[model samples]
Target: SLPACPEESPLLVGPMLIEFNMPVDLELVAKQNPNVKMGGRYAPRDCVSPHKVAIIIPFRNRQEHLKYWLYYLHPVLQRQQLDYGIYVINQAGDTIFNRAKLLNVGFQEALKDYDYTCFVFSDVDLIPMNDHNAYRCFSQPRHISVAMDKFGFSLPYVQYFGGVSALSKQQFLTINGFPNNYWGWGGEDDDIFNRLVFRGMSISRPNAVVGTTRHIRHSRDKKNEPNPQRFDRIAHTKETMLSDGLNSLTYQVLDVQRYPLYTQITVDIGTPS
Candidate 1:
């Protein structure tokens, strides 16, 4: 059961200016951000839900960029009339970049709050250009951002499965979240794409024009260099998915914070075995 809200709580306090980089409190968000509509499951006094969707982000630093993500996405998601919340599952301390694993953490952490039906795995640096590009999950796997400012607002390849994407609870559970062993980057997205195919599912995407994005400027973070082996891994995702994937995932959370606007959970993946 969800934790009961205290009477003299942050919920009674007026909205504060939470920095874009900070993680949000899942509990506080549930209590404070009142839903203007219905559909969300709540007993007693039905609390407000910012959106029906929850955006799950994997983060490590990039505070300024994260702010931009919150700046654009928060309102955009709200405008979509979704009972939503943003969950940034940050890798704590000085750990190797593990994008997929953090996403899994984000999903698990989000489920702790509302009955979030859809999950949007997104990058903090990428902002959608078209607000009409709804952030909520669809009937099928939906790729929200097709054209990105980083790639001249165009998909670099047919398998360029980065940027923003969404899936229903069942869709995500079917794929078992994502691969935690891609290590650096690149291969993880491709690996997830293959997971969908293996489950007799196909990726649904928004049109390039509607799925356009604006990337906040920043240099790439250290150790996040493109994987030289990504191409080969992607080429063989079907062969290796089951053996080395979410099923074998291993990690631990270092810190968890809940605020009115968001829930920030930091994790230390340690050294990947």
Candidate 2:
């Protein structure tokens, strides 16, 4: 069981400013919210929230980016009044980075400890500029970062489903989770979008005004060079979606650390195929 609030905590109504220069002190951040339990669980001390969420970050070799994410998200999520825990599912070894498979590992790993109903698979480099964007899932899959600063705070394309997004456990299982074969970036999000649509679910989003976010600048990982096979894979999602996801996921959890800010689960996701 988690902490419960005695009164309703009002949600923040608008966007927030991104604080890039803020230094992260994990101990200090933990002290500020002493009530958040081990494994990064926190709920309003006065009231019960509507959803139990797990914030799953697909991480690699980005220490600086992870710092900023922890600093910003801890406060924003608390303000949003969610019953949530943070899980940083890292891809171990120097093999090609499998972003989607790590996310699949995250969902399965988080469930081993808590009954998280909603899962937010976030890139470690993206930070939401709004508390109202609500990190929880909806009746339909919710695209939380609808307007990103990297693209002039605009949607790059009509089918863009990258950055940050949430899916209820059922919704995620319905689409079979993300494809395991997307060994690098570029195609996984599109594959996920295709999977959701093929399974009869439409994407939902907050108004652009309230869904703003910032991307922390960073060079792409060497192993994360765009996959040449992505285009062919995207075209075949309808055929592969049923067999290429959570059911096919394979990984080993190297470590699970519970820090004050978030739970870091280092995983060996194996070499890319």
Candidate 3:
């Protein structure tokens, strides 16, 4: 049975570690936790949570990583006692994969069903080493993935918003969502930071111990090349943010599926110039 209240729940403490060297059996794991409802959504059965969160993952061609994310996050989120739903906003086709654009689509699509007040924009490869990191949003935008093994378990820089983070609906809209023009990886995270600052919002982060996250190692995908124009686009964030975000987002929902573990929304976000 789940905890009757969030405070009654046991917070994960001490060193948390993850091993990706061996194959993970997704079916076996799911069978053990049959309570996680269809499309990977869950809330505590014993008590009601104050926040409704949407876990938005922009993905393409990372099957193993998705399996691991589902394997871990479902339990962690359930423990957090959040009314949460997982949305895997998959970009269809072999065209350039826009991480930020898919995230925008996720924000829009998630709202098509339930009202999600907070959104966790996460990289499918990143898994929270500590469940205490808390998947819900805060007063300010929360950077949940602070201590990552990739950066020796410390934030790479002051403005880093990569890996995993949470944003309230108001905060996300104030930033005009992420830059859709950033058709590949690189500048989108930074652009989001700039947007938050432009709207007078300070960033919040978890302590290193609680913020630790494990990154599943994998080579970059073929369509997801580094954005050569990232620098220029970031430079003009103040000017383009209001016009180029959720207000300007365009895409077609190829399909929407409610799998046993999570909701997968496939979209044709189109090719980059």
Candidate achieving the largest lDDT? 3
Give the alpha-carbon lDDT of every model.
0.70, 0.86, 0.87
Give the per-residue Cα lDDT of candidate 1 at 221.
Answer: 85
Question: Model 3 off-target regions past 4 Å?
Answer: 1-4, 11-14
Candidate 3 structure quality by residue, lDDT tens digits, 80-128: 8888999999889988889999999999999998989999999999999
Candidate 3 residue pairs that clash:
39-262, 40-261, 40-262
Tens-digit lDDT track of model 2 for 7-126: 334667566778777677777767877777777788877677878999999887887888888778888888878899999887789978888988999999899888999999999989
TM-score of each: 0.79, 0.94, 0.95
Residue 132's C-alpha lDDT in candidate 1? 62
| Candidate 1 lDDT (Cα, 0 to 1) | 0.70
Q: Give the TM-score ranking, best first.
A: 3, 2, 1
The numbered model that scores best in TM-score is 3
lDDT of 1 by residue, 1-273 (tens): 434433222322222232344555434444543542232222224444433577888898876676556555555555454556678888877756888888887787678777788899998888877666767677778887798767887888886677789989889888777877767767788788888888888878878777878766677788777767777877776767666655676668777776445578888776657
Error of 2 at 91 (Å): 1.0
Name the 10 consecutive residues with the lowest summed lDDT in model 3.
1-10
Model 3 residue 55 lDDT? Answer: 94
